[PDB]
Design a protein around this ligand. Structure first.
Ligand SMILES: Nc1ncnc2c1ncn2[C@@H]1O[C@H](COP(=O)(O)OP(=O)(O)OP(=O)(O)O)[C@@H](O)[C@H]1O
Ligand SMILES: Nc1ncnc2c1ncn2[C@@H]1O[C@H](COP(=O)(O)OP(=O)(O)O)[C@@H](O)[C@H]1O
Ligand SMILES: [Mg+2]
Ligand SMILES: [Mg+2]
Lengths: 441, 883
């Protein structure tokens, strides 16, 4: 039954397919680690632990809730099954009615009644499943040699891989692709690493899929040697024999707005005091618009991708504005229009999204004496007799002092709570609908 | 082997002119020429030419502009090193917008002439690359000195009408741009704008008055300069209405500004263009007098995003719905900076042109980058990614296409897309922009302002509201293009009508009728008429065309065609629509009357003008591509003449064809392959590009027609380029077609016989007969309108067979014989394509509707020699043997 569920998962996306031998090795892991009911429970925990990391967040919750449903339908009584299907139906807005009543059930009813969809979806993972595997756990407990990492756009696992390098004492050779010289360098470095060793990394094989499907299937126990491959979930389909021969892992984006501000601010090394202030405001605006992007049905109309190239373009534009102005009268309207229309609004085809970006630019780049960019913190204007090192010191201090509240998706992004609850309702509805479709057959 | 010997001789002479007259390949060529002089040597010469690519590549590297032409054409040009021919007539493909050389001058495609600073001596000893480089440098420095003395005259204080009639369009254009920028900056140092606004308004009025009375080329120049002068007026008017100085500074920084460096020792790099703080160097390349785009605010936004992309050496990507003007935006950006953007209408030729434009330094736009196959798309994406990676890192040289080639610092690559997308490698180094629908109101308003209409803003608003009402209310046909292209077509066709209808709403209404009404159905025509009554105040007063109508009626009477109201309407539409458009497309159902319509129009024009008419009915699909145009035989480098090329050569060489109107009718389906090779004549160029490179001119009276039945495989570009006339309903009645068929069958007691036959075809019973016949089940379903051509002809020929026994019988028996033959022909033509039981049912219907007084046609009845009998007496019993 669990393998049929995983086959149904693989029938949806090209990255979620599962082989029979993988499931049999996952079952062998139960007896390797250190009565029939305990073996069954360990099987459920081990399958979830080893096959959550190959799926994204929505399919993580779908798999967890379906596997909990299967185990509890086998173990518990009929009234338990009817109650759980009632809660799934009211989450999916398909069936209505109070459960016919257990601390877990009343906790879950308290979660559902107060309209907390995230808590209702995470209750299964919080209650039943114990262990969760990060990138280090899946790379350490793998006998495989080639690792394929997939993620959405505007997020990269390369920083996590360098963190693992600093943790596992290894050196990565990042190999960008896209040019024939880079292809020859990649082939030379793979030939070097397959003989000597060392962790070898490949970035974004999506545009080099031709070289991949002409080289890597034919190319596919060295010590301290693991090959990491990075692709994109939304890109073109990878070859099936290549996919079956590698340990597929999906890396997930951060939820922190202020963490994105820190990440953008720590990578800007220097161009006077006003350039530093403008770069700080640009980092905050980039983090705010990137955070607002991910709320696809409500924050925007479609899915856009404001990468670091847009930040580089806007930074060069701010540098050119600050350089060619000797009166220190910053043209705030000019930079607002050029950022909302040319830099960030260029790829936007809709009109409402352009209005959203224009409103965000008017709120962030207003250039007032006391700017409250979020409901939490206010950024004062710089003084004309301060060094750039002092300016960076006070900007770092005001970044470290402030904290991110629980409702940062509403207050910081300037969104009503109704939109957030409606988005969470849509997420829970599609998760529960997919679970019901899995559970009927 | 005569053709092989001729080809070998031609190859030997060409290569001797290329290299022999002025090492291993040279020795092999010398040995092969010695063997040919002693005497299948063609493959050896082809392999020698293939091995001579390194010398060919060095020749192409000597002067970069020679690279554009093909290998055969370049070999032909470099082989003619003494005659100084074929290089001036084919440098349009190299220089993009310059047609011929006058050295004392050059001629662009539009006909503008450039006067060089000084003459260049031409001699037979000078090779192609040296004098070509001298000509290029002299052209650029002549453009710079025209710039210089234009600013000398303008800063002197002279009038603009004296300098608009002297120098080329680029010089006066950029002189006006720089002068306007200086005045706007000087008046931005203060808060006074009305004086220079009034001055440029008076300049606009003076250029309009000079436009009214000058020649055609000068008229084109004044139009292309009034576009920018109206833009200057718009910018100054916007800056005048600004409340604060900050808003004025914002508006001035948004628009495109021009400056000149007065301190650099260099000349061609003394101009930088400022837009939102970024700088670009003007190139001083020649473009001619092209169709200047109307500077809408979205055009300035497109210029701003292309400037922002090119400041950091990123490519420019545009995407959006088709028809929003992205290709023209890129071209206008290129020609605003005085350079020609090379257009690749989307592997060997593509990457060849790509390395050519990255070696020359000219900008290249990949228009419609959504139609290539996956492998070539990915590989050219890798090529452009390599080019952009070289440009961003400032590499002096690039290893592109497995050769080491220099990288020009001014090379840029642009992409336009038509979704309804850019690959990852390209998107890592390109800037995507999504331009919206263009301001049709502003474009139409400015076009009307140049054209001299006293009411421009309200009239343009009414026109765009009318077109949007038709796009929202009419049916969703595949050929209903109501975008900006057809609006510009309406405005362009408003130009010949003003000489008789005047600058006003009436000309717009009449041209709107003439180029919108033909391409609509029936309910669409009703909607068009109602909306034209509602929006435009003019009711569409009739014009004076009684002479043409009478000529049409005389043509119909002498050709047998009757004149219904709808046939008259279609003929008048076709005539008024062929008065302006060169190549026309006639569409409609099968057998609806297209050929009759245009034949009647031709006869009417022949009577009205007294002018000779030549018709070449050439079906498109009956000739192959080689037979219709021409085939270059690769066996011996020979040429074969196609039919259309042969008749163009015959009409060009000619004294009969110099005083005649010659018409080519393509009376079959529209093939995309047969028309994409014809695209060179459909536009205003009117020049046919043969596969061998021959350019045959087409006279203005050489009017092309088309005649098909469907448009599902016709490109929308050819739909807009050619005129489309739609036959929604038949141009005939049943009685009129019957009368014409009778008349042509008579032409192909006689008067009494004709009168009796015509009186026997009573329309009252015939309409019911045809209505009953249309309800039956017919195999290979053909309309009754296309069965009348047999139903009349069969009866006419049967009576023509029985005419010689018609002088020895009574009148009633003659009427019975005529009626029986008519009933038999009606049976075997209308219901003659159905079952026997249905044929018998049609006999019962015929006997019911033609009355019992007439002779009752039986199921097996006939006429034997005359007496009435059946076929049962005509059956011979056959005694067959065993084997
Ligand atoms: N004014 C008219 N009065 C009477 N009959 C007419 C008139 N105009 C056309 N017809 C008839 O229409 C018939 C249709 O033939 P025609 O040559 O016009 O077809 P067409 O337009 O070439 O059709 P297709 O190419 O689709 O076969 C003619 O045979 C002619 O008898
Ligand atoms: N700003 C403008 N001024 C004048 N004409 C314009 C302008 N923008 C677009 N057009 C007209 O719109 C027409 C359609 O452009 P088109 O070639 O279809 O663009 P694309 O190929 O990118 O869709 C062109 O013939 C052009 O003359
Ligand atoms: Mg285009
Ligand atoms: Mg025809």
């Amino acid at each position: 039954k669990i393998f049929s569920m995983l086959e149904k998962f693989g029938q949806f996306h090209w990255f979620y397919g599962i082989s029979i031998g993988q499931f049999l090795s996952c079952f062998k892991r139960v007896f390797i680690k250190k009565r029939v009911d305990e073996i069954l429970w360990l099987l459920y925990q081990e399958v979830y632990c080893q096959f959550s990391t190959a799926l994204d967040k929505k399919f993580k919750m779908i798999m967890a809730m379906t596997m909990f449903c299967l185990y509890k339908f086998d173990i518990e009584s009929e009234q338990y099954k009817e109650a759980v299907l009632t809660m799934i139906g009211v989450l999916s807005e398909s069936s209505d009615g109070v459960p016919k009543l257990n601390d877990d059930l009343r906790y879950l009813w308290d979660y559902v009644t107060t309209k907390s969809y995230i808590s209702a979806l995470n209750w299964f993972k919080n209650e039943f499943f114990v262990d969760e595997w990060n990138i280090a756990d899946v790379v350490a407990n793998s006998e495989n040699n080639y690792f394929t990492m997939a993620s959405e756009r505007d997020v990269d696992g390369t920083f996590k891989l360098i963190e693992l390098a600093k943790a596992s004492k290894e050196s990565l050779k990042i190999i960008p692709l896209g040019s024939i010289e880079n292809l020859n360098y990649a082939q030379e470095e793979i030939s070097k690493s397959k003989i000597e060793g060392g962790w070898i990394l490949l970035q974004n094989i999506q545009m080099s899929l031709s070289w991949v499907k002409t080289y890597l299937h034919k190319h596919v126990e060295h010590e301290k040697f693991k090959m990491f491959m990075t692709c994109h979930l939304t890109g073109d389909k990878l070859p099936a024999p290549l996919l079956q021969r590698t340990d597929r892992v999906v890396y997930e984006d951060i939820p922190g707005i202020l963490d994105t501000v820190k990440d953008l601010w720590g990578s800007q090394f220097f161009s006077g005091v006003w350039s530093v202030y403008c770069t700080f405001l640009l980092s905050w605006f980039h983090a705010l618009i990137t955070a607002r992007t991910r709320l696809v049905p409500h924050g925007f109309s479609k899915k856009y991708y404001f990468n670091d190239c847009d930040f580089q373009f806007a930074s060069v534009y701010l540098e050119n504005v600050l350089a060619t102005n000797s009166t220190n009268n910053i043209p705030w309207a000019q930079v607002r229009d050029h950022i909302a229309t040319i830099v960030y609004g260029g790829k936007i085809d809709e009109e409402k999204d352009l209005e959203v970006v224009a409103k965000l630019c008017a709120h962030v780049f207003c250039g007032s004496d006391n700017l409250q960019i979020v409901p939490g913190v206010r950024i004062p204007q710089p003084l004309l007799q301060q060094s750039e090192e002092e300016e960076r010191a006070r900007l770092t201090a005001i970044l470290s002092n402030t904290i991110e509240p629980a409702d940062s998706l509403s207050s910081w992004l300037q969104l009503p709570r109704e939109s957030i609850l409606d988005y969470e309702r849509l997420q829970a509805k599609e998760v529960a609908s997919s679970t019901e479709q899995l559970l009927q057959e | 082997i005569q053709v092989n010997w001729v080809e070998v001789q031609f190859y030997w002479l060409d290569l001797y002119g290329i290299l022999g007259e002025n090492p291993l390949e040279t020795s092999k060529f010398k040995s092969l020429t010695s063997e040919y002089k002693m005497i299948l040597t063609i493959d050896s010469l082809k392999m020698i030419k293939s091995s001579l690519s390194t010398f060919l590549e060095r020749q192409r590297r000597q002067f970069p502009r020679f690279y554009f032409l093909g290998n055969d054409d370049l070999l032909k040009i470099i082989g003619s090193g003494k005659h100084h021919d074929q290089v001036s007539k084919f440098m349009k493909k190299m220089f993009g917008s310059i047609e011929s050389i006058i050295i004392t001058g050059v001629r662009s495609v539009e006909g503008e002439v450039l006067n060089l600073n000084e003459k260049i001596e031409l001699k037979d000893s000078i090779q192609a690359q040296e004098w070509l480089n001298i000509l290029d440098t002299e052209i650029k420095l002549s453009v710079f000195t025209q710039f210089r003395d234009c600013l000398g005259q303008l800063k002197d204080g002279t009038d603009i009408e004296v300098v608009v009639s002297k120098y080329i369009f680029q010089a006066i254009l950029l002189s006006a741009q720089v002068m306007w920028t200086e005045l706007v900056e000087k008046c931005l140092q203060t808060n006074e704008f009305s004086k220079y606004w009034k001055e440029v308004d008076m300049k606009i009025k003076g250029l309009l008055d000079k436009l009214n009375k000058s020649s055609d080329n000068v008229k084109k120049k004044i139009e292309a300069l009034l576009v920018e002068y109206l833009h200057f007026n718009n910018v100054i008017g916007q800056l005048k209405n600004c409340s604060t100085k900050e808003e004025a500074r914002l508006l001035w920084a948004k628009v495109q500004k021009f400056y000149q460096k007065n301190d650099t020792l260099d000349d061609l790099n003394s101009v930088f263009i400022s837009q939102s703080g970024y700088l670009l160097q003007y190139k001083f390349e020649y473009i001619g007098i092209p169709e200047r785009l109307i500077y809408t605010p979205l055009l300035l936004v497109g210029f701003a995003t292309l400037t922002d992309s090119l400041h950091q050496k990123y490519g420019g990507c545009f995407f959006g719905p088709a028809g929003t003007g992205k290709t023209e935006t890129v071209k206008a950006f290129g020609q605003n900076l005085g350079r020609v953007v090379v257009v690749f209408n989307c592997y060997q030729v593509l990457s060849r042109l790509l390395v050519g434009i990255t070696q020359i330094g000219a900008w290249g736009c990949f228009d419609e980058f959504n139609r290539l196959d996956e492998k070539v798309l990915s590989a050219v994406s890798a090529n452009i990614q390599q080019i952009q990676n070289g440009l961003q890192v400032g590499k002096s040289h690039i290893t592109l296409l497995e050769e080491e080639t220099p990288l020009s610092p001014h090379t840029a690559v642009f992409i336009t897309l038509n979704p309804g997308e850019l690959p990852e490698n390209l998107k890592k180094s390109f800037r995507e922009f999504s331009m919206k629908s263009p301001q049709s109101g502003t474009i139409a308003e400015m076009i009307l302002q140049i054209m001299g209409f006293e009411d421009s803003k309200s009239l343009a608003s009414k026109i765009v509201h009318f077109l949007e009402l038709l796009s929202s209310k009419c049916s969703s046909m595949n050929h209903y293009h109501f975008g900006l292209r057809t609006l510009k077509g309406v405005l362009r066709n408003c130009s010949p009508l003003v000489s008789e209808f005047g600058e006003g709403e009436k000309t717009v209404v009449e041209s709107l009728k003439r180029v919108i009404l033909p391409s609509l159905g029936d309910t669409d025509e009703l909607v068009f008429k109602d909306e034209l009554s509602k929006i435009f105040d003019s009711a569409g007063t009739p014009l004076n065309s009684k002479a043409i109508v009478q000529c049409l009626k005389d043509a119909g009477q002498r050709s047998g065609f009757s004149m219904s109201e709808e046939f008259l309407k279609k003929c008048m539409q076709f005539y008024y629509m062929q008065k302006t458009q060169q190549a026309l497309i006639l569409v409609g159902k099968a057998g609806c009357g297209k050929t009759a319509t245009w034949k009647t129009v031709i006869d009417a024009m022949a009577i009205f003008d007294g002018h000779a008419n030549v018709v070449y009915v050439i079906d498109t699909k009956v000739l192959t591509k080689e037979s219709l145009y021409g085939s270059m035989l690769k066996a011996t480098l020979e040429w074969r003449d196609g039919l259309f090329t042969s008749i163009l050569r015959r009409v060009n060489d000619d004294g009969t064809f110099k005083n005649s109107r010659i018409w080519v009718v393509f009376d079959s389906d529209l093939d995309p392959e047969y028309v994409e090779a014809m695209n060179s004549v459909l536009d205003d160029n009117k020049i046919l590009t043969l596969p061998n490179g021959e350019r045959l001119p087409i006279p203005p009276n050489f009017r092309i027609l088309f005649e098909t039945d469907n448009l599902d495989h016709t490109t929308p570009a050819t739909i807009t380029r050619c005129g489309l006339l739609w036959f929604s309903t038949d141009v005939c009645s049943i009685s009129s077609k019957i009368d014409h068929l009778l008349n042509k069958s008579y032409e192909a007691e006689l008067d009494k016989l004709k009168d009796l036959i015509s009186d026997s075809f009573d329309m009252a019973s015939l309409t019911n007969i045809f209505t009953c016949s249309n309800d039956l089940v017919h195999i290979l379903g053909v309309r009754t309108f296309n069965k009348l051509e047999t139903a009349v002809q069969l009866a006419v020929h049967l009576i023509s067979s029985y005419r010689q026994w018609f002088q020895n019988l009574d009148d009633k028996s003659l009427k019975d014989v005529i009626t029986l033959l008519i009933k038999r022909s009606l049976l075997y033509a209308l219901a003659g394509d159905s079952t026997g039981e249905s044929q018998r049912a049609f006999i019962q219907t015929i006997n019911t509707y033609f009355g019992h007084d007439s002779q009752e046609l039986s199921d097996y009845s006939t006429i034997v020699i005359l007496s009435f009998s059946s076929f049962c007496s005509e059956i011979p019993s056959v005694s067959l043997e065993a084997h």
